[PDB]
Amino acid sequence: EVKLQESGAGLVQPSQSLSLTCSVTGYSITSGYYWNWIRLFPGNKLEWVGYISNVGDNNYNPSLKDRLSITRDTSKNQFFLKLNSVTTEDTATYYCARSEYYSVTGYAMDYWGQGTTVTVSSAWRHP
Amino acid sequence: MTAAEHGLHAPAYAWSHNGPFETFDHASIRRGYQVYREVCAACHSLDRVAWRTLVGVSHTNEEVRNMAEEFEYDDEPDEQGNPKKRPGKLSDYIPGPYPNEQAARAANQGALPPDLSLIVKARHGGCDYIFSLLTGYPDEPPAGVALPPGSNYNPYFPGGSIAMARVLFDDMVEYEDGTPATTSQMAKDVTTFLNWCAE
Amino acid sequence: WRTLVGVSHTNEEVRNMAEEFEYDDEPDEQGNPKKRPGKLSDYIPGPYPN
Amino acid sequence: SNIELAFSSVEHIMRDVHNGYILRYLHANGASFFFMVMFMHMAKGLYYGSYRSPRVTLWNVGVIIFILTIATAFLGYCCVYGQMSHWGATVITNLFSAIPFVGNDIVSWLWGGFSVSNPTIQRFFALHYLVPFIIAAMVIMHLMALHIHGSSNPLGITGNLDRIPMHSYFIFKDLVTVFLFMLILALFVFYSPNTLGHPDNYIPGNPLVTPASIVPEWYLLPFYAILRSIPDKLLGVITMFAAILVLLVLPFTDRSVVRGNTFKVLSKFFFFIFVFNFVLLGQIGACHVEVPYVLMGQIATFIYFAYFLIIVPVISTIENVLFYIGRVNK
Amino acid sequence: VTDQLEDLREHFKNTEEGKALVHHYEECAERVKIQQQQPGYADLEHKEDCVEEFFHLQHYLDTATAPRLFDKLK
Amino acid sequence: DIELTQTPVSLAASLGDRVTISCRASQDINNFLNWYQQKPDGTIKLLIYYTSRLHAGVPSRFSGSGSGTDYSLTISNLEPEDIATYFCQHHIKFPWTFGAGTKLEIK
Amino acid sequence: KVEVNLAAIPLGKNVVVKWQGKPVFIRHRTPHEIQEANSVDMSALKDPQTDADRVKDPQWLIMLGICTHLGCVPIGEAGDFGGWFCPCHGSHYDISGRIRKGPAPLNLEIPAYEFDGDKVIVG
Ligand SMILES: CCCCCCCCCCCCCCCCCC(=O)OC[C@H](COP(=O)(O)OCCN)OC(=O)CCCCCCCCCCCCC
Ligand code: HEM
């Protein structure tokens, strides 16, 4: 069975970088599909962030193409998300998801991660 | 392999033809034909069996001639090249119910009723298997067994799921010699007749 | 038909010539007989049925 | 031989030809008997050391004949065009797709098309008729090699000090076994014609369905089991073919100073391990590719090869020394 | 006249061995129907059936009826 | 950037009746539209992909009609409970975009 | 070439048709089957291939029913991987037609095809 396990700082100070990590098991990142990042803003509204294909090709949302960096670690079988210089607008619950591609049905995200609630705040948290 | 996949082992009935010195019971053969004609013929062909082969085995010459003449066969076209039919003769082969395979599958929900000219030799079990399949249909499949709509449960059939429903029922046929036409009596008669068709 | 190709006609010319004739096709799902236009694998049809 | 007419033509022989069922049952059962007698002929050889000098040429021609006979029997089985015929033809011709590069090309050439079809059955009949005459010719070469050295004997020593003429003695002794052979064969032909066969071959070949009940002819099972024991395609066919070729190694791996097993306790014992292991390999052959059987087949396959390459040379060497120290007082 | 084979099977279903065999099956048939009533049965993959029990019973009846049936037929 | 607008954005109904949500896009998308179920507990699964295809595990009581620019997601009942926000996305070209959402509360 | 009416083919059922003398397997895969197919780890395959490289439409698995070992036709809905089982030498294929166990070295080969409404055309 395929599984996506998310982890990472669920609170980042404005201006700092957001670093989330999605751990995939049961399937291989390099095998063949697309590994995405998506966010649910406070008030129900989904936005596609971007992805990294099995080869290494990056395709981001032009809305965030200048701040994000979706990398991966083939040896650990997991991909990451990095959103530089965050604003309170970046506050949302982030979800990593695998999207499969078939030439007739197109794309479809079948495996979603647990989800990580991130909050841009000047509040202090024990590292 | 699981018992279901193998199929239930067909037991050893006391066929009168079993044994080095034993011939067939020609009375049983004559009855089996009747059963084949009135119950099996509607779905199963007997292509390798010619009318003439019945004469002197289970029927007289005149009897076979009459049965044969009840069917239509293609004849040589007339003087203008028009196709024309003809009644059957001793040299013809017993006719099947369908003109082709497509038609055969249509009348049986996709399945193809196999020819029975060699069915006795074409199955592990021979007579024992045939008879056991024809008389071994439960009324309901064992608990927990999912039967795909269009199937019927029979333990002797490998996989247990057979596309042929039970067709033999008590007194469904009226034997000429007045023999109690029970389901097992009929299975014993067709099977004997089918063994002769094969050998 | 296919033997005319490369000898006296092109692939197209023969294909078109053959498609002007009918041949017995495989029967439908119901078992009824059906026709079909000829192809390169067929033989030049005769004028009489018998 | 037409693929559309083959099966029915055999049925025509079975029903319409006077005494035709006797011809077919004799031919069919005759094939099995041919193999049972050949296995005993070969076994007799291993046992009495008939393969050793000066009879190696004799043995090598024999191995050649064995292969030819197997190919013939295979071609014959294909001519019936039953369900076993079709699939047997497919599997066996495909055995050659293991050859690197030219592999699939040879198969296409043997088939004469996209799959086992008309061109295949017709050529297989033509070749089935041809090989038996090649075998007859090899049998002459076999007899020629036998003749210059004569037969060996159960004592494994020279027969030159006491010979008796072939005529009367062995002409009439051979007659004894001829009648016995005919008696047993008649028993099957008339009373159990299909015991050694397969019911599936009474079903016309179907290019779209391989029966789940598919099993090779009994005489090929041991070799079939050897092939299945290797979880690799190429290595599987090579091992199976090596199983026949390793018979050529016996003249060199038999280190014994005496010919035959008559006076050899260890060799007599291991010889029967070999015989029953061969029989077991055949039994595994008739079973499904399932847990206990797969391991048993692999170990039995190993024993089969170990016999010629390890057991015989070790045991024969040991016995050489046993015969020596067991009497020589020094 | 009722089917001779059906009679013989009915007779043998009533021997001690027969009753124990039908009991074993019926015991299985109950466990199964109760399994089908349970929530989420459709998605188990490890579903139980009673073919083995049924085969054991049918095998017993066959072994008894086979050598007798044809003496009761024409 | 293609934009989708679901309707009726946030609806309600009783356990039993057949509800019917629907999406709409600016441009013409072939049938490249997927539907997602978003449980209140923060869990999100795929429901329907490529207009009508059902994903593994989703009940037959989930239809998916549509073409060109109009799409729908019909049901039959809510047993045990399908109370969650339903989204819809497109994918004929990047970037992909989701709908406004459609809560399905019971009252 | 050859056509096949996909409108006829029910849910989780197989259909075998003849094309160039070789059999062509076509299955109308169920949603669960489609998932099982794209959810397998490559490392568990001697012949690594994604379900996506084998089918144009997840709903229709179309392939040549020729065991890549020695030619036999695999039996449908059999074997230990919810796919096909070859009776000849014990080769099991999964719901995507990939080789999972046995002497066969390759996944069932995918032939050239095109869709066209309610029917498909193989060849
Ligand atoms: C490719 C590989 C080819 C090789 C395959 C071999 C297959 C096996 C062949 C089947 C039959 C086996 C034949 C046995 C071989 C020859 C046996 C033999 O020669 O035995 C001689 C032995 C005693 O003979 P002596 O000559 O040594 O006596 C001297 C007296 N001072 O007398 C005895 O040992 C007693 C006779 C033993 C009978 C053989 C029993 C085994 C039967 C197998 C059953 C077949 C199952 C279907
Ligand atoms: C008493 C008359 C009949 C006899 C003796 C008979 C016998 C048989 C036998 C021996 C088989 C082969 C089973 C196997 O493959 O192992 C069979 C199959 C079949 N029969 Fe009959 N049959 C009879 C009547 C009928 C009738 C009337 C029909 C059509 C309504 C029918 C339809 C079929 C079908 C479709 C199969 C396919 C089974 C499968 O592969 O699932 N049979 N029959």
Ligand SMILES: C/C=C(C)/C=C/C=C/[C@H](OC)[C@@H](C)[C@@H](OC)[C@@H](C)CCc1oc2c(O)c(OC)cc(OC)c2c(=O)c1C
């Ligand atoms: C034109 C002439 C040609 C191409 C001749 C080719 C000859 C090849 C070899 O003969 C030398 C070959 C027959 C010989 O291999 C050494 C046999 C032991 C092969 C044994 C054999 O049989 C099978 C069989 O019989 C079957 O039947 C239904 C089915 C089979 O699989 C399901 C097999 C099989 O898997 C094997 C290995």
Ligand code: FES
């Ligand atoms: S042919 Fe399928 S496994 Fe050998």
